[PDB]
Coordinates of C-alpha atoms and ligand atoms in Angstrom, one line a residue:
Chain A
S1 CA -4.7 -14.2 0.6
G2 CA -1.7 -14.4 2.9
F3 CA 0.1 -11.5 0.9
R4 CA -0.8 -7.9 0.6
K5 CA 0.3 -5.2 -1.6
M6 CA 2.8 -3.4 1.0
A7 CA 4.4 -0.1 0.3
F8 CA 7.5 1.2 1.7
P9 CA 7.2 3.7 4.5
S10 CA 6.9 7.2 2.8
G11 CA 8.3 9.4 5.5
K12 CA 11.8 10.0 3.8
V13 CA 10.0 10.9 0.5
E14 CA 7.5 13.2 2.2
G15 CA 10.2 15.3 3.4
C16 CA 11.2 15.9 -0.1
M17 CA 7.9 17.0 -1.6
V18 CA 7.3 20.7 -2.6
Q19 CA 5.0 22.6 -5.0
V20 CA 5.9 24.3 -8.2
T21 CA 3.9 26.9 -9.8
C22 CA 3.9 28.7 -13.0
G23 CA 1.0 31.3 -13.3
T24 CA -1.9 29.4 -11.9
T25 CA -0.5 25.9 -12.8
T26 CA 0.6 24.2 -9.7
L27 CA 2.0 20.7 -9.5
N28 CA 4.4 18.7 -7.3
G29 CA 8.2 18.8 -7.3
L30 CA 10.9 16.6 -5.5
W31 CA 13.4 18.7 -3.3
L32 CA 16.7 16.9 -3.0
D33 CA 19.9 18.8 -1.9
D34 CA 19.5 22.2 -3.6
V35 CA 17.6 21.0 -6.8
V36 CA 14.0 20.7 -7.3
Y37 CA 12.8 18.2 -10.1
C38 CA 9.2 18.5 -11.6
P39 CA 7.5 17.8 -14.8
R40 CA 8.3 20.2 -17.6
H41 CA 4.7 20.8 -18.5
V42 CA 4.3 23.0 -15.4
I43 CA 5.5 26.0 -17.8
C44 CA 2.5 25.1 -20.2
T45 CA -0.5 27.2 -20.8
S46 CA -3.4 25.1 -22.0
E47 CA -3.4 26.7 -25.5
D48 CA 0.4 25.6 -25.9
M49 CA -0.4 22.1 -24.4
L50 CA -1.9 20.8 -27.7
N51 CA 1.5 20.7 -29.0
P52 CA 4.2 22.7 -26.9
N53 CA 7.5 24.1 -28.1
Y54 CA 9.1 23.5 -24.8
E55 CA 12.5 25.0 -25.6
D56 CA 10.9 28.0 -26.8
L57 CA 8.5 28.3 -23.9
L58 CA 11.5 28.0 -21.5
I59 CA 13.5 30.6 -23.2
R60 CA 10.9 33.1 -22.1
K61 CA 11.0 31.9 -18.7
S62 CA 13.3 33.6 -15.8
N63 CA 14.2 32.1 -12.4
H64 CA 11.7 34.6 -10.9
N65 CA 8.9 33.2 -12.9
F66 CA 8.9 29.9 -10.9
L67 CA 7.1 29.9 -7.4
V68 CA 8.6 26.9 -5.3
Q69 CA 7.1 26.2 -2.1
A70 CA 7.7 23.7 0.8
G71 CA 4.2 24.3 2.4
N72 CA 3.7 28.0 2.5
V73 CA 7.5 28.7 2.7
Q74 CA 8.9 29.9 -0.6
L75 CA 12.3 28.5 -1.9
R76 CA 14.0 31.1 -4.1
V77 CA 14.8 29.7 -7.5
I78 CA 18.4 30.5 -8.7
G79 CA 18.7 28.6 -11.8
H80 CA 16.7 26.4 -14.2
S81 CA 17.6 23.7 -16.9
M82 CA 15.5 21.2 -18.9
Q83 CA 16.5 17.5 -18.8
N84 CA 14.2 15.6 -21.4
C85 CA 10.7 16.0 -19.9
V86 CA 11.7 17.1 -16.4
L87 CA 12.6 20.6 -15.1
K88 CA 15.5 21.1 -12.9
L89 CA 15.2 24.2 -10.5
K90 CA 18.2 25.1 -8.6
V91 CA 17.1 26.8 -5.1
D92 CA 19.0 28.6 -2.6
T93 CA 18.4 26.2 0.1
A94 CA 19.6 22.6 0.5
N95 CA 16.8 20.4 1.7
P96 CA 17.8 19.4 5.3
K97 CA 15.5 16.2 5.0
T98 CA 17.3 14.9 1.8
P99 CA 17.9 11.2 2.2
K100 CA 20.5 9.0 0.9
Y101 CA 19.1 8.6 -2.7
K102 CA 19.7 7.5 -6.2
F103 CA 17.9 7.8 -9.5
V104 CA 17.0 4.5 -11.2
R105 CA 15.2 3.4 -14.4
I106 CA 13.3 0.3 -13.7
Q107 CA 12.0 -2.6 -15.9
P108 CA 8.7 -3.7 -16.7
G109 CA 7.5 -6.1 -13.8
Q110 CA 9.3 -4.3 -11.1
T111 CA 7.2 -2.7 -8.3
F112 CA 7.5 0.6 -6.4
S113 CA 5.6 2.8 -4.1
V114 CA 3.8 5.8 -5.2
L115 CA 3.3 8.8 -2.9
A116 CA 0.2 10.5 -4.4
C117 CA 0.6 14.3 -3.9
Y118 CA -1.6 17.3 -4.5
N119 CA -0.1 20.8 -4.1
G120 CA 2.8 19.5 -2.4
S121 CA 1.0 17.6 0.3
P122 CA 1.0 13.8 0.5
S123 CA -2.5 12.2 0.2
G124 CA -1.6 8.4 0.2
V125 CA 0.8 5.8 -0.7
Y126 CA 0.5 2.5 -2.4
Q127 CA 2.3 -0.1 -4.4
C128 CA 2.4 -0.1 -8.3
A129 CA 3.8 -2.4 -10.9
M130 CA 5.3 -1.2 -14.2
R131 CA 3.2 -3.1 -16.8
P132 CA 5.1 -4.6 -19.8
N133 CA 3.4 -1.9 -21.9
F134 CA 5.1 0.7 -19.7
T135 CA 1.9 2.1 -17.9
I136 CA 1.1 1.7 -14.2
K137 CA -2.5 1.1 -12.8
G138 CA -2.3 4.1 -10.5
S139 CA -4.8 6.3 -8.7
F140 CA -4.2 9.8 -9.7
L141 CA -6.4 13.0 -10.1
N142 CA -5.7 16.4 -11.4
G143 CA -2.8 18.0 -9.7
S144 CA -1.1 14.8 -9.2
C145 CA 1.8 15.3 -11.7
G146 CA 5.2 15.4 -10.1
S147 CA 4.4 12.6 -7.6
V148 CA 7.1 10.2 -7.5
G149 CA 7.5 6.5 -7.3
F150 CA 10.3 4.9 -5.2
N151 CA 11.8 2.0 -3.5
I152 CA 13.8 2.0 -0.3
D153 CA 17.0 -0.3 -0.1
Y154 CA 18.3 -0.1 3.6
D155 CA 19.1 3.7 4.0
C156 CA 18.7 4.6 0.4
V157 CA 15.7 5.8 -1.5
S158 CA 15.8 4.9 -5.2
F159 CA 13.5 7.3 -7.1
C160 CA 12.2 5.7 -10.4
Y161 CA 9.0 7.3 -11.5
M162 CA 7.5 10.8 -11.8
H163 CA 4.0 11.2 -12.8
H164 CA 2.9 13.0 -16.0
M165 CA -0.3 11.6 -17.5
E166 CA -3.6 9.4 -17.6
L167 CA -4.4 7.5 -20.8
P168 CA -7.9 6.8 -22.1
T169 CA -8.0 3.3 -20.6
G170 CA -7.5 4.8 -17.1
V171 CA -3.7 3.8 -16.6
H172 CA -1.0 6.1 -16.1
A173 CA 2.4 7.1 -17.6
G174 CA 5.4 9.0 -16.6
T175 CA 9.2 9.3 -16.7
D176 CA 12.2 8.4 -14.7
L177 CA 13.9 11.2 -12.6
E178 CA 16.2 12.0 -15.7
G179 CA 13.0 13.0 -17.6
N180 CA 12.8 9.9 -20.0
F181 CA 9.4 8.7 -20.4
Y182 CA 8.7 4.9 -19.7
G183 CA 7.3 3.7 -23.1
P184 CA 6.5 5.4 -26.0
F185 CA 4.6 8.4 -24.7
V186 CA 5.1 12.2 -24.9
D187 CA 4.2 15.0 -22.8
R188 CA 1.6 16.5 -25.1
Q189 CA -2.2 16.7 -24.7
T190 CA -2.5 14.7 -28.0
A191 CA -4.4 11.5 -28.1
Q192 CA -2.2 8.7 -27.0
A193 CA -3.1 5.0 -26.1
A194 CA -1.3 2.2 -24.1
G195 CA -0.3 -0.7 -26.2
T196 CA -1.7 -4.4 -25.4
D197 CA -0.7 -5.3 -21.9
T198 CA 0.7 -8.7 -21.2
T199 CA 1.2 -10.8 -18.1
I200 CA 4.3 -10.4 -16.1
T201 CA 5.9 -13.8 -16.2
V202 CA 8.7 -13.4 -13.8
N203 CA 6.1 -12.2 -11.0
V204 CA 4.0 -15.1 -11.7
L205 CA 6.8 -17.4 -11.2
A206 CA 7.5 -15.5 -7.9
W207 CA 4.0 -16.1 -6.6
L208 CA 4.3 -19.9 -7.5
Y209 CA 7.5 -19.9 -5.6
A210 CA 5.7 -18.2 -2.9
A211 CA 2.9 -20.8 -2.9
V212 CA 5.4 -23.6 -2.6
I213 CA 7.2 -21.8 0.4
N214 CA 3.8 -21.8 2.1
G215 CA 3.2 -25.5 1.4
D216 CA 0.8 -25.3 -1.7
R217 CA 2.8 -27.3 -4.3
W218 CA 0.2 -29.5 -6.4
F219 CA 1.3 -27.9 -9.6
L220 CA 5.0 -28.9 -9.6
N221 CA 5.7 -31.5 -12.0
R222 CA 8.6 -33.8 -12.9
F223 CA 9.7 -32.2 -16.1
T224 CA 11.7 -29.0 -17.1
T225 CA 12.1 -27.0 -20.3
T226 CA 14.5 -24.8 -22.1
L227 CA 14.2 -21.0 -21.6
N228 CA 13.6 -20.6 -25.4
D229 CA 10.7 -23.2 -25.6
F230 CA 9.0 -21.7 -22.6
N231 CA 9.2 -18.1 -24.0
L232 CA 7.7 -19.1 -27.4
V233 CA 4.8 -20.9 -25.5
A234 CA 4.3 -18.1 -22.9
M235 CA 3.8 -15.6 -25.8
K236 CA 0.8 -17.6 -27.0
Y237 CA -0.9 -16.9 -23.6
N238 CA -0.1 -13.2 -23.7
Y239 CA 2.5 -13.7 -21.1
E240 CA 5.8 -11.9 -21.4
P241 CA 8.8 -13.8 -22.2
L242 CA 11.6 -14.1 -19.6
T243 CA 15.0 -12.4 -19.7
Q244 CA 18.2 -13.6 -18.3
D245 CA 17.7 -10.8 -15.6
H246 CA 14.4 -12.5 -14.7
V247 CA 16.0 -16.0 -14.4
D248 CA 18.7 -14.1 -12.2
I249 CA 16.2 -12.4 -9.8
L250 CA 14.4 -15.7 -9.2
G251 CA 17.7 -17.2 -8.2
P252 CA 17.1 -16.6 -4.3
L253 CA 13.6 -18.3 -4.5
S254 CA 14.9 -21.1 -6.6
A255 CA 17.6 -21.7 -3.8
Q256 CA 15.1 -21.4 -0.9
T257 CA 12.9 -24.0 -2.5
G258 CA 15.4 -26.1 -4.3
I259 CA 13.3 -25.8 -7.6
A260 CA 15.2 -24.6 -10.6
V261 CA 13.9 -21.7 -12.4
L262 CA 13.4 -23.9 -15.7
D263 CA 11.5 -26.6 -13.8
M264 CA 9.2 -23.9 -12.4
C265 CA 8.7 -22.7 -16.0
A266 CA 7.7 -26.2 -16.9
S267 CA 5.1 -26.2 -14.2
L268 CA 3.7 -22.8 -15.3
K269 CA 3.7 -24.0 -18.9
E270 CA 1.4 -27.0 -17.9
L271 CA -0.9 -24.6 -15.8
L272 CA -1.2 -22.4 -18.9
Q273 CA -1.9 -25.3 -21.4
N274 CA -4.2 -27.3 -19.0
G275 CA -5.7 -24.4 -16.7
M276 CA -6.3 -25.0 -13.0
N277 CA -8.8 -27.9 -13.4
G278 CA -10.9 -26.1 -10.8
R279 CA -8.2 -25.5 -8.2
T280 CA -6.6 -22.7 -6.4
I281 CA -3.1 -21.5 -5.6
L282 CA -2.6 -19.3 -2.4
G283 CA -6.5 -19.3 -2.3
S284 CA -7.0 -18.0 -5.8
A285 CA -7.8 -19.5 -9.2
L286 CA -6.3 -16.4 -10.7
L287 CA -2.5 -16.2 -11.0
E288 CA -0.9 -12.9 -9.4
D289 CA 1.5 -10.9 -11.4
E290 CA 2.2 -7.7 -9.2
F291 CA 4.5 -9.3 -6.7
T292 CA 8.1 -9.5 -7.5
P293 CA 10.6 -12.0 -6.2
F294 CA 11.7 -9.2 -3.8
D295 CA 8.1 -8.4 -2.6
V296 CA 7.9 -12.2 -1.8
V297 CA 11.1 -12.1 0.2
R298 CA 10.0 -9.0 2.0
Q299 CA 6.7 -10.5 3.2
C300 CA 7.7 -14.1 3.8
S301 CA 11.2 -13.9 5.4
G302 CA 11.8 -10.2 5.9
Chain B
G1 CA -8.0 4.5 -11.0
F2 CA -8.4 2.6 -7.8
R3 CA -6.0 1.2 -5.4
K4 CA -5.7 0.2 -1.8
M5 CA -4.3 3.4 -0.4
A6 CA -2.6 4.0 2.9
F7 CA -2.0 7.3 4.7
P8 CA 1.5 8.6 4.4
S9 CA 3.4 7.1 7.3
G10 CA 6.0 9.8 7.9
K11 CA 4.4 11.3 11.1
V12 CA 4.4 7.7 12.7
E13 CA 7.9 6.7 11.6
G14 CA 9.1 9.6 13.7
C15 CA 7.7 7.9 16.7
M16 CA 9.0 4.3 16.3
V17 CA 11.5 3.0 18.7
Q18 CA 13.1 -0.2 19.8
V19 CA 12.4 -1.7 23.2
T20 CA 14.3 -4.6 24.9
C21 CA 13.7 -6.5 28.1
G22 CA 15.9 -9.6 28.4
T23 CA 15.9 -11.7 25.1
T24 CA 12.7 -10.0 23.9
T25 CA 12.9 -7.0 21.5
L26 CA 9.9 -5.4 19.9
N27 CA 8.6 -1.9 18.9
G28 CA 7.6 1.1 20.9
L29 CA 5.6 4.2 20.0
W30 CA 7.3 7.4 21.5
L31 CA 5.0 10.2 22.0
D32 CA 6.1 13.1 24.1
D33 CA 8.2 11.6 27.0
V34 CA 6.5 8.2 27.0
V35 CA 7.2 5.2 25.1
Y36 CA 4.0 2.8 24.7
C37 CA 4.6 -1.0 23.7
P38 CA 3.1 -4.4 24.4
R39 CA 3.5 -5.5 27.9
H40 CA 4.4 -9.1 26.9
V41 CA 8.0 -7.9 26.3
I42 CA 8.5 -8.4 30.0
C43 CA 7.5 -12.0 29.7
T44 CA 9.9 -15.0 29.8
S45 CA 9.4 -18.3 28.1
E46 CA 8.7 -20.1 31.5
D47 CA 5.8 -17.6 32.0
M48 CA 4.3 -16.9 28.5
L49 CA 1.5 -19.7 29.0
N50 CA -0.2 -18.1 32.1
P51 CA 1.8 -14.7 32.8
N52 CA 0.6 -12.9 36.0
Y53 CA 1.7 -9.5 34.4
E54 CA 1.3 -7.4 37.6
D55 CA 3.5 -9.7 39.3
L56 CA 6.1 -9.7 36.6
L57 CA 6.0 -5.9 36.4
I58 CA 6.7 -5.2 40.0
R59 CA 9.8 -7.4 39.6
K60 CA 11.3 -5.3 37.0
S61 CA 13.4 -2.1 37.3
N62 CA 13.5 1.0 35.0
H63 CA 17.0 -0.3 34.0
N64 CA 15.7 -3.6 32.8
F65 CA 14.1 -1.8 29.8
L66 CA 16.6 -0.8 26.9
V67 CA 15.0 1.8 24.7
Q68 CA 16.8 3.0 21.5
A69 CA 15.8 5.5 19.1
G70 CA 18.4 4.7 16.3
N71 CA 21.8 4.6 17.8
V72 CA 20.8 6.5 20.8
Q73 CA 19.5 5.0 24.1
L74 CA 16.6 6.8 25.9
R75 CA 16.8 6.5 29.7
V76 CA 13.6 5.1 31.3
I77 CA 12.8 7.0 34.5
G78 CA 9.4 5.3 35.2
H79 CA 6.9 2.6 34.1
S80 CA 3.3 1.7 34.5
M81 CA 0.9 -0.9 32.8
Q82 CA -2.4 0.0 31.4
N83 CA -4.2 -3.1 30.4
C84 CA -2.1 -4.8 28.0
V85 CA 0.2 -1.8 27.2
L86 CA 3.4 -0.9 29.1
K87 CA 4.1 2.7 29.4
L88 CA 7.8 3.8 29.8
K89 CA 8.5 7.3 30.9
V90 CA 11.7 8.4 29.3
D91 CA 13.8 11.6 30.2
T92 CA 13.6 13.2 26.7
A93 CA 10.6 14.4 24.8
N94 CA 10.3 13.3 21.1
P95 CA 10.4 16.5 19.0
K96 CA 8.9 14.7 16.1
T97 CA 5.6 13.9 18.3
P98 CA 2.7 14.7 16.0
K99 CA -0.6 16.2 16.8
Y100 CA -2.5 13.0 17.9
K101 CA -5.2 11.2 19.7
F102 CA -6.1 7.5 20.7
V103 CA -9.3 6.2 19.4
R104 CA -10.9 2.9 19.4
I105 CA -12.2 1.9 16.0
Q106 CA -15.3 -0.1 15.1
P107 CA -15.4 -3.3 13.0
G108 CA -15.7 -2.5 9.5
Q109 CA -13.5 0.8 9.8
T110 CA -10.0 1.0 8.1
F111 CA -6.7 2.2 9.0
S112 CA -3.1 2.0 7.9
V113 CA -0.4 -0.2 9.5
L114 CA 3.1 0.6 9.7
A115 CA 4.8 -2.7 10.2
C116 CA 8.2 -2.3 12.0
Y117 CA 11.0 -4.5 13.2
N118 CA 13.6 -3.5 15.7
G119 CA 12.3 0.1 15.9
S120 CA 12.6 0.6 12.0
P121 CA 9.6 1.0 9.7
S122 CA 9.6 -1.7 6.9
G123 CA 6.2 -1.3 5.2
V124 CA 2.8 0.3 5.3
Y125 CA -0.5 -1.1 4.1
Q126 CA -4.3 -0.7 4.7
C127 CA -6.2 -3.1 6.8
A128 CA -10.0 -3.2 8.1
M129 CA -11.0 -4.3 11.5
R130 CA -12.8 -7.4 10.7
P131 CA -16.4 -8.0 12.4
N132 CA -14.7 -10.7 14.4
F133 CA -12.1 -8.3 15.6
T134 CA -9.1 -9.8 13.8
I135 CA -7.0 -7.9 11.1
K136 CA -5.7 -9.6 8.0
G137 CA -2.1 -8.2 8.1
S138 CA 1.3 -9.1 7.2
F139 CA 3.4 -9.4 10.4
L140 CA 6.3 -11.5 11.4
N141 CA 8.4 -12.2 14.4
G142 CA 9.3 -8.9 16.0
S143 CA 6.4 -6.9 14.7
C144 CA 4.8 -6.4 18.0
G145 CA 4.4 -2.7 18.8
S146 CA 3.8 -1.8 15.3
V147 CA 0.7 0.6 15.1
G148 CA -2.2 1.3 13.0
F149 CA -3.7 4.7 12.4
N150 CA -5.6 7.2 10.6
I151 CA -4.9 10.7 9.7
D152 CA -7.4 13.7 9.7
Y153 CA -6.2 17.3 9.0
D154 CA -2.9 17.2 10.8
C155 CA -4.1 14.9 13.4
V156 CA -2.9 11.2 13.8
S157 CA -5.6 8.9 15.4
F158 CA -3.8 5.9 16.7
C159 CA -6.2 2.9 16.8
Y160 CA -4.3 -0.3 16.9
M161 CA -1.0 -1.9 18.4
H162 CA 0.0 -5.3 17.3
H163 CA 0.3 -8.2 19.8
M164 CA -0.3 -11.5 18.1
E165 CA -1.0 -14.0 15.3
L166 CA -3.7 -16.6 15.3
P167 CA -3.2 -20.0 13.8
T168 CA -5.4 -19.2 10.7
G169 CA -2.7 -16.4 9.8
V170 CA -4.8 -13.5 10.9
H171 CA -3.9 -10.9 13.6
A172 CA -5.0 -9.5 16.8
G173 CA -4.1 -6.5 19.0
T174 CA -5.3 -3.6 21.2
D175 CA -6.1 0.0 21.1
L176 CA -3.6 2.4 22.7
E177 CA -5.3 2.1 26.0
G178 CA -4.2 -1.7 26.0
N179 CA -7.7 -3.2 25.6
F180 CA -7.8 -6.1 23.1
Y181 CA -10.2 -5.9 19.9
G182 CA -11.9 -9.2 20.3
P183 CA -11.8 -12.0 22.8
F184 CA -8.1 -12.6 22.6
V185 CA -5.6 -12.6 25.4
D186 CA -1.8 -11.9 25.4
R187 CA -0.8 -15.4 26.7
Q188 CA 1.2 -17.7 24.4
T189 CA -1.7 -20.1 23.5
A190 CA -3.4 -21.0 20.1
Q191 CA -6.5 -19.0 19.9
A192 CA -9.3 -18.9 17.5
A193 CA -11.7 -16.1 16.4
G194 CA -15.4 -16.1 16.1
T195 CA -16.8 -16.7 12.7
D196 CA -16.1 -13.7 10.4
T197 CA -18.6 -11.9 8.2
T198 CA -18.2 -9.7 5.2
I199 CA -18.4 -5.9 5.7
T200 CA -21.6 -5.2 3.5
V201 CA -21.3 -1.2 3.5
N202 CA -17.7 -1.6 2.2
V203 CA -18.5 -4.0 -0.4
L204 CA -21.1 -1.5 -1.6
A205 CA -18.7 1.3 -1.4
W206 CA -16.3 -0.7 -3.6
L207 CA -19.1 -1.5 -6.2
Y208 CA -19.7 2.2 -6.4
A209 CA -16.0 2.7 -6.9
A210 CA -16.0 0.1 -9.7
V211 CA -18.9 2.1 -11.4
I212 CA -16.9 5.4 -11.0
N213 CA -14.0 3.6 -13.0
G214 CA -16.4 2.3 -15.7
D215 CA -16.9 -1.3 -14.5
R216 CA -20.7 -1.9 -14.4
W217 CA -21.5 -5.5 -15.8
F218 CA -22.8 -6.3 -12.5
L219 CA -25.8 -3.6 -12.4
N220 CA -29.3 -4.5 -12.9
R221 CA -32.8 -3.0 -13.3
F222 CA -34.1 -4.7 -10.1
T223 CA -34.8 -3.1 -6.8
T224 CA -35.0 -4.5 -3.4
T225 CA -36.1 -3.3 0.1
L226 CA -33.7 -2.9 2.7
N227 CA -35.1 -5.5 4.9
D228 CA -35.2 -8.2 1.9
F229 CA -31.7 -7.2 1.0
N230 CA -30.6 -7.8 4.7
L231 CA -32.4 -11.2 4.8
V232 CA -30.3 -12.4 1.8
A233 CA -27.1 -10.9 3.1
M234 CA -27.3 -12.4 6.5
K235 CA -27.8 -15.8 4.8
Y236 CA -24.5 -15.3 3.1
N237 CA -22.8 -14.1 6.3
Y238 CA -22.8 -10.6 5.2
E239 CA -23.4 -8.0 8.0
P240 CA -26.7 -6.3 7.8
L241 CA -26.9 -2.9 6.3
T242 CA -28.3 0.0 8.6
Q243 CA -29.9 3.2 7.6
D244 CA -26.9 5.1 8.8
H245 CA -24.9 2.8 6.3
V246 CA -27.4 3.8 3.6
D247 CA -27.0 7.4 4.4
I248 CA -23.2 7.2 4.5
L249 CA -23.4 5.9 0.9
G250 CA -25.5 8.9 -0.4
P251 CA -22.5 10.8 -1.8
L252 CA -21.5 7.8 -3.8
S253 CA -25.1 7.3 -4.8
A254 CA -25.4 11.0 -6.0
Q255 CA -22.1 11.0 -7.8
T256 CA -23.1 7.9 -9.7
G257 CA -26.9 8.4 -9.8
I258 CA -27.3 4.9 -8.6
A259 CA -29.8 4.5 -5.6
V260 CA -28.3 2.6 -2.6
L261 CA -31.0 0.0 -2.9
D262 CA -30.3 -0.5 -6.5
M263 CA -26.7 -1.3 -5.7
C264 CA -28.1 -3.6 -3.0
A265 CA -30.1 -5.3 -5.9
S266 CA -26.8 -5.9 -7.9
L267 CA -25.1 -7.2 -4.8
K268 CA -27.8 -9.5 -4.1
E269 CA -27.6 -10.9 -7.6
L270 CA -23.9 -11.5 -7.4
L271 CA -24.2 -13.2 -4.1
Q272 CA -26.9 -15.6 -5.5
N273 CA -25.2 -16.1 -8.8
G274 CA -21.5 -15.4 -8.6
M275 CA -19.3 -13.4 -10.7
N276 CA -19.1 -16.2 -13.6
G277 CA -15.6 -15.6 -14.9
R278 CA -15.8 -11.8 -14.8
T279 CA -14.0 -9.6 -12.4
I280 CA -14.6 -6.3 -10.8
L281 CA -11.7 -3.8 -10.5
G282 CA -9.4 -6.7 -11.2
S283 CA -10.8 -9.1 -8.5
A284 CA -12.5 -12.3 -8.6
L285 CA -13.9 -11.8 -5.1
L286 CA -15.9 -9.2 -3.6
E287 CA -13.6 -6.6 -1.6
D288 CA -14.8 -5.4 1.8
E289 CA -11.9 -3.4 3.2
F290 CA -12.7 -0.1 1.4
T291 CA -15.1 2.2 3.5
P292 CA -17.3 4.7 1.9
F293 CA -15.0 7.4 3.3
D294 CA -12.0 5.5 1.7
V295 CA -13.6 5.4 -1.8
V296 CA -14.7 9.1 -1.7
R297 CA -11.4 10.4 -0.6
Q298 CA -9.7 8.5 -3.4
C299 CA -12.2 9.6 -6.2
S300 CA -11.9 13.3 -4.7
Ligands
VLU401 C1 -0.9 16.2 -14.1 O1 -0.7 17.5 -14.8 C2 -2.0 15.5 -14.9 C3 -2.3 14.2 -14.3 C4 -3.7 13.7 -14.9 C5 -4.9 14.4 -14.8 C6 -6.0 13.6 -14.2 N1 -5.4 12.3 -13.8 C7 -4.0 12.3 -14.2 O2 -3.1 11.4 -14.0 N2 -1.4 15.3 -16.0 C8 -2.3 15.7 -17.4 O3 -3.3 16.3 -17.3 C9 -1.6 15.6 -18.8 C10 -0.6 16.8 -19.1 C11 0.0 16.4 -20.6 C12 0.6 15.0 -20.6 C13 1.2 17.5 -20.7 N3 -2.6 15.2 -19.7 C14 -3.1 13.9 -20.0 O4 -2.9 13.1 -19.0 O5 -3.8 13.7 -21.1 C15 -3.7 12.4 -21.6 C16 -3.5 12.4 -23.2 C17 -1.9 12.4 -23.3 C18 -4.1 13.6 -23.8 S1 -4.1 10.8 -23.8 C19 -5.9 10.9 -23.6 C20 -6.9 11.2 -24.7 C21 -8.1 11.2 -24.4 C22 -8.8 10.9 -23.3 C23 -8.0 10.6 -22.2 CL1 -8.6 10.1 -20.6 C24 -6.6 10.4 -22.3
CL402 CL1 -3.6 -5.9 -0.9

């Protein structure tokens, strides 16, 4: 309670969604300036999906085999190339709705909004976290590939995710906008599985900071720890080790509360070793790990 | 395979503007040549405790209202009040005005909120109208005039405009006719809501969602009558389940092959026993802000 998963407003991304069709296979693409980005498996027949030779499938393709549409309006394709697992289709029209944007590759633990799309039309938007096993717990059906995940910083859309697949456990995997998968997955219809997931320590710490900011601070103790000692203990509880970047992005919440990051780690260490003893934090007996330090700032101070 | 999903907010973002009167700034909704916003923008500090709004509005001029759409000021050429909403007529029509209507939602229904500050969209999330006519939102200073909405076909149904926070941290507001949901009043006083209840038909929709996604540890072989379930529900401050609700659940029942009253039997067992360590769709608590329509749209 107090916090909810808040997505970024989706309008700037909605203005960039199109559909891309090869034969009868339609998925979503992202139209920025005069380039459309989409998953390369749009060019696959199901026979060639068991294990595709993408370079060879693409040699047989011409610009005029790709049907790109913004709604019902066709955008003529004038060039094509493959970059890793994404297709780049040059089109003859620069998207007038192109926002200021960048392509970023996010780290596990970071959150982003997903604009779920089908045949080029948005259905919904929600907030996802990249798990340490490089999956997301999304909500995706057939025809959703090419949907993108993004953050907005002032004027600028940072695109971080394009959707490609669903795994047996029901979680989802995909690439950055340079076509590089997050995690060890491949865009082939061969059996693959997500590694064992772990808890996102940096986000749990952000949540404890958030609890302190709201006056819920019984779990603070008078001790500290080294980063190494904490990481070795955390791993025993299936918690991710902290990086230096994690310590850095906790900086603003550390300053707001006056609680050093390593002192908060010592408090978390005691919670892990001793449990809640029947208590709650921000209403919950469970520790939340899908709010980043930035998400906390957004909702408390923003 | 299940998330709290909001409608895409682009059609509403194209309507948000900033409205300023004196030292007060909040958001307005610009449709055609009219901007809608909470009337308490005209309020001063020395009047917020018992504001005679009709009296305060007659003392204002069109030029006291600064409306800005981005870096562009819109000229106000007229103004009226409809209940707790101020209507500012401006000289230019919003070309981004979508197909739309104003609706009043019922408790238990859900909608998306576009939280805005200074006329700029900041975040989007899904909310439910609580049975006590509050909403559990995330709203800060300056968020007033933010709107809640649903989308059907290409039509945006506006149902909520944000006015206030209660001491318990929940929120209250009006429909776009300016009528509050609940017994709340747009004066600067601490106000409390009636006792809340849990939206039972929605908890059931969410249990069906957890089945669809393979969670079924909570199912059982028992069955219950509708009335006997409702007796237990009311004891735990759950809303009673109507036969219209049973019908509304049919698709989810058919899709899973679990009779509605069988799912009621599972919910009764959870209410009486608890979850006992276990979680459903990741939660330790029963979720009641997904409607049947919500769950279906997302599992279809
Ligand atoms: C978009 O094309 C689509 C999106 C999924 C369809 C249903 N929900 C989705 O998120 N993507 C695909 O269908 C994938 C296309 C391939 C990767 C080129 N196919 C896919 O997701 O298959 C999953 C694997 C890789 C075969 S692992 C697996 C094995 C057995 C059972 C399951 Cl559920 C997954
Ligand atoms: Cl939430």
